[PDB]
Write a protein that binds this DNA or RNA. Sequence first.
RNA 1: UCUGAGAGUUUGAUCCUGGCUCAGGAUUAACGCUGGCGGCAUGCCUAAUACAUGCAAGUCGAUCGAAAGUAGUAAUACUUUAGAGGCGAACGGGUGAGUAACACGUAUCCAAUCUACCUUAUAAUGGGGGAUAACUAGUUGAAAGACUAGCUAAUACCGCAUAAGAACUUUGGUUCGAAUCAAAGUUGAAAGGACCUGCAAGGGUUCGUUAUUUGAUGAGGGUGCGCCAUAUCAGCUAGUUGGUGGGGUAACGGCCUACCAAGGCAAUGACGUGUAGCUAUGCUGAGAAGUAGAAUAGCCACAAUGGGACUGAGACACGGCCCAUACUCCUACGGGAGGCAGCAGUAGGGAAUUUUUCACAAUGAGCGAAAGCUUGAUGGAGCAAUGCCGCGUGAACGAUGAAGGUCUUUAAGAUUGUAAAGUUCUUUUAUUUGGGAAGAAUGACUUUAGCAGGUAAUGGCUAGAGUUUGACUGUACCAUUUUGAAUAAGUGACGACUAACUAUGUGCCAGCAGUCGCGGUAAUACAUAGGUCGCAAGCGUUAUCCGGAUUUAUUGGGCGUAAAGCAAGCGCAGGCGGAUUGAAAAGUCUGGUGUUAAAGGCAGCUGCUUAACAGUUGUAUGCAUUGGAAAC
RNA 2: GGUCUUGUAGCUCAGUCGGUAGAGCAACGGUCUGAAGAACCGUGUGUCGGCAGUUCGAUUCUGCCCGAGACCACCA
Lengths: 80, 393, 203, 77, 67
Amino acid sequence: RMGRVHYPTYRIVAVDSRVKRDGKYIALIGHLNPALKENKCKIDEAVALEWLNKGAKPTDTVRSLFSQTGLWKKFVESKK
Amino acid sequence: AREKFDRSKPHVNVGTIGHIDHGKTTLTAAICTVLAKEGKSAATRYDQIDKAPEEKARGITINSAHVEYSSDKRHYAHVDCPGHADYIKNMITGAAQMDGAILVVSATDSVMPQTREHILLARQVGVPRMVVFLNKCDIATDEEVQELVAEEVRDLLTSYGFDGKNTPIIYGSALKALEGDPKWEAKIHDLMNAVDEWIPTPEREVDKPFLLAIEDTMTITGRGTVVTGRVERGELKVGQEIEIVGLRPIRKAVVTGIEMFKKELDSAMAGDNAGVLLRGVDRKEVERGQVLAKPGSIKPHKKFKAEIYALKKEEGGRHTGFLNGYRPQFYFRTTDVTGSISLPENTEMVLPGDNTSITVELIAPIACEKGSKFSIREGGRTVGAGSVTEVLE
Amino acid sequence: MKYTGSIFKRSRRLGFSLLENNKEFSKGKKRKTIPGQHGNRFRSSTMSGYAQQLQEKQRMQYMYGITDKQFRRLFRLVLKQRGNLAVNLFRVLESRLDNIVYRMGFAPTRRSARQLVNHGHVLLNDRTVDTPSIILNPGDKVRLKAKTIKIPIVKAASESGVVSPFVETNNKTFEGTYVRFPERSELPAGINESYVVEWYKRL
Amino acid sequence: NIKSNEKRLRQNIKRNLNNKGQKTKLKTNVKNFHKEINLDNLGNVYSQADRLARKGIISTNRARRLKSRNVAVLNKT
Amino acid sequence: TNGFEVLTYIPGEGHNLQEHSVTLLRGGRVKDLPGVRYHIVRGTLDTVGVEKRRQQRSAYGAKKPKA
RNA sequence: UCUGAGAGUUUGAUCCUGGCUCAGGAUUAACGCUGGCGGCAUGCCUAAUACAUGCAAGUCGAUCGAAAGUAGUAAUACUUUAGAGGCGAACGGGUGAGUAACACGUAUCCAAUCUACCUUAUAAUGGGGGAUAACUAGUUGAAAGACUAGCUAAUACCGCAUAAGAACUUUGGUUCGAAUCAAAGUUGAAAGGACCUGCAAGGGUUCGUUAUUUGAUGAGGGUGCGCCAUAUCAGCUAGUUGGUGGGGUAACGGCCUACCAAGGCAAUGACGUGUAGCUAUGCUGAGAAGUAGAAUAGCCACAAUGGGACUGAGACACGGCCCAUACUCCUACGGGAGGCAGCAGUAGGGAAUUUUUCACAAUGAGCGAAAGCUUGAUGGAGCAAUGCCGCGUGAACGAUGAAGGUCUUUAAGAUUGUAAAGUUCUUUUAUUUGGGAAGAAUGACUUUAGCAGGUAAUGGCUAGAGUUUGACUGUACCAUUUUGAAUAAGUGACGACUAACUAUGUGCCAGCAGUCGCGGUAAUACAUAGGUCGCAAGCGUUAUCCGGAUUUAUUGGGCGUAAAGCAAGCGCAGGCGGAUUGAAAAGUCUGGUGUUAAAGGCAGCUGCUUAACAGUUGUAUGCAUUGGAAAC
RNA sequence: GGUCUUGUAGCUCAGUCGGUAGAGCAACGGUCUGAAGAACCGUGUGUCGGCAGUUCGAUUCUGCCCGAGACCACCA
């Protein structure tokens, strides 16, 4: 989380597996506000499929987010 | 773990008294070794009592050194009180922080000014239940002289305020006990049981917030300035505020770590002889003769008026009067502070007798309250003793 | 400092009044010169456009009961928006919560209104408010409290209200609505806006 | 400190022994090819180079470069 | 604190600096002293700038007299 | 879109040029005074000085042998690992002394390169051998440890058959040194485990391992560009410059080596000197531009110093190794052990800067069929008004004017002054009760409902359930919760610049002061009092940044007498320079593309109760390049 | 933390095992200069940091502190 202390604000983190937190991002795919969710969560989802096709597997906390936006509903479809 | 302390027994502070060169070190080692067999946490403290030059090079005592040892019934914190007149200021400090008193006086070298001054000081400090153990009893032909020493100590107890009836006069030898002879070790067992037959445990109260008085401060590598002392009132946990009284205006600080002779505590109750490291405090700001307290009841002053029971010349006090510029050094509970005797109106001299409430101003303010016993010494001999009964400020 | 500690003296010296002019017209053979043990005969040490500019700034900011820091920060905030900065700023000067209540006429001193608002006794849109520096918006519902209907000063001034067209309210439920911006006639005329507003260039 | 350093060193003792043996055996094969040039011995050198290439002993280009520079002089025949 | 030696003035009433007593310096420009353009802290850690300077006691170091 | 202040200071006195100071903000701030509180931010720049104690990198019994305990007569089953195997340990953390040149950044070339784990398609899971750890017995030693004789496992190690395809070339094919094909020769692979099905054979799914390979990623190199001061610093350089053969390299390469030549840079400033992490950025002004390089991020080096090298895809390796150097520790004096510029912490210096705090809950990362474990990373807490913002130090009424003090110094008044008392109200806070957030609108657990190439099912996709993950939390917030105007302001100046005046004292003695300048016995300047003014929960001081400083004059000076025209001239480079026709676009302008990180500078919106703060939206100059313009 | 040393005029220092309190600056009344300073005749101050022995005699011997000054603390 980055922002005001005691105020969570963590945007998406899907970067190369050997990159530090809040370093030089590979790409920005929307943003997320853990302080207040439910119409403060959004991803571009445009180049997301390509980024998945080139490494950078989703982490534990973003599987739901991909299922939230329907990415998981077309993830296994695209692999086949 | 900083060798965490464990306590399950009533904590008392015992202490040896007498004139040095009689073998105080060997007697302390003998009693510690005797109680080592009765339970652990007790080691032979013979050369562990010395930390100053000529204190080990000669084999004498200069300062009040503390050791600790538990038992199946009671815990004890032993304190060594030195002789070497003009060093009495050290031993009264031990009187500041002891509960039981063990007299160590030689027989063939029967009572000298040192012993009488020590007993008188123990009387005027406010510590009861003196215990007398005869030493150097291994000396041959001690039939008619051992009874003489017992009678002399019994009569000398009364000569200053104590009594020579309630406490039995134990006898035996410590050098042979140091060697490990079973009979004299049994005599030391008997002395310890006699101690257990008196000197009740201190009362535990929490209503009064917190109070402690420092014995000495010292630097500890990687930690900082660490002070010693003993809790008087209330409890104390790790990370609480404190106020500093003495020699300076009140100074607010915070504690960092509580230990008991480098044995860490978890819940420091009232009456425990321990030491504390504070948070961001300078060693030149807290010294020996200072007080830690909690806000709500404390007020420092330099000039105050209190009653004094002056010691007559027949009792060893001054045989002549003095002026309003007369400047003794009073020894309040844990503080050795010089104060002039600025006698108020209708008072210009304190001779033997004429117990009048005197007013004195001290160089350093002290945590004062009615009922605080203290003594007056000047010229090499103690000249008076009293308690706080009036507060002008 | 938040509260000056005295209100009459500042108006006595700067030649203005907290109210229109009723604050000081007669107080039992009251004075009219500038106060002080020596303002009776000598009146000036350095008076010019700059000095009168500071004087007008004081008569403004002490009238609105806001610290100098607050004036500077409001100037910085109005720098954010465009157009005639002085006119819009002067319009917002009476748009404060306690200022809005003062224009409603619920109290004859902004200090009292500040106390009422910061004590949590004023109700703004299903949310208690205790910070009298909230930005308003044309068309906002305002009310103080039903429970405060028993306050003697509120009851005394309920019928002796203040008629300011730019804000409308009803004293039956002590409820009104911020609708439209104010104008010059609705605002005090004893202070020259221009000197006050041009003096802030350092920030 | 880290306790997984003595383990690394003890693994490295055997690793270094094996690698030095393989490299000096390859060096011996290079000497043999120096003192005589034929087909079967060069095939043995090929086999040993690929044994090294089985593991990460030799870089993917080092073996290729050395055998190319060897066949450069092989092409004399 | 280094080998450099600087001249300075003693502001306030009286001079109580006494030949190896620790000092703290201060800046400021003056025109009265030929060769000296520095002042010394008067009223802190050795002196007091007496008192009653209710108008300036932060400068001219003096703790506020509490009554 | 946008925006520029001045004043005083020479002199009998005026003008011009010209200098000086002040009037603004700002800090990684400091001293002193004042001291309520919430939130936010921030809190060694100086001695890269050495460091008590603990910690920051471990991990996997379903990778394996073996051992121990427990249930158990036993078999076996559960729990654990001292070790072997492999993964990470080459990220992650901090510091800027050294480093003044690919240091940095940007764009291309990377036909001069690599890239295991991850992605696309896909090959295999054959067969043998030998040791060797744990262990047993010791030998030298207060200790690091070292040394031997014997016995065993593995997905350890070593060979061997074998091996689609891959690599080397021989002949041919495409092609502007690169790319693929055809034929010929040669070369090299290991490892199965777990579960399920089947009475066995055998079969199935999954994991990695080999044989690859299409990608991204990470790493590395060259070049154009400019990126401290240094002409009271003109010669420097001999693998130096170039060619030849050979070797290393992740590569091209004097990178190095054996041979042969004598070159290369430079007045458009080389060589050499002092200084320094750089950049984004932050600060300043409207502006071009000037300042520093907080924190935060990328790049670079570092691990007390100097070297060397083992390993592996990744090192000369922040908490690998050896050597020497220096300190520390002990030393039966035989000899070894350690390296906080990691969280902290002591000492010391410094004017100067916080805890040997909590949880690893959120996140990320590492490991692992799997539960799970760990992370002084990370998120928090406390101290410090260190800085910004908010909010309190009450409120209405109430005077021919309470009292006192001060001035007037004296028949009186004014001032303090609605200030005071008094009348009345109420509670951000003050003092506390009860209820009490979310962050677990993340992921995994379990049967499941449906479903997929597979069925006997595992592994998997979509939805359903909870005990599971709460230190913050007496938080926030709510209910007249109890009481309750009760809980709280100082500070600099008052002749001018610079908002504000009078009086008492000392009398050029004392002291002020930034300057003009104050005081030679009534000080609108000193010491002091009253009052006032201005700032403020902060206030003034030094240190130093830009404005003014146009005070280096691109913007924005010139050189008759205030400062400068060489003493004069000829003249190379260089700079500028008559006109017309044609060309192109080298410069120039324009449209498309990449880049100019995000945050910030600008504004809007949203969430912060609001402000501050956080997030979102659009957001510059610049280079390379495509397509044009051809007036200059 | 204890181990030693020091305290004398307004200031700086001398003060034989007591017999005076002694010098320098400041210093006051004069000599002198327009004036300030230089130089000259001279004033004088001295409870000896505070208490009891003791020297007939405490400031010259001690003990105790008071104010101050430096000296080292322990050892894995």
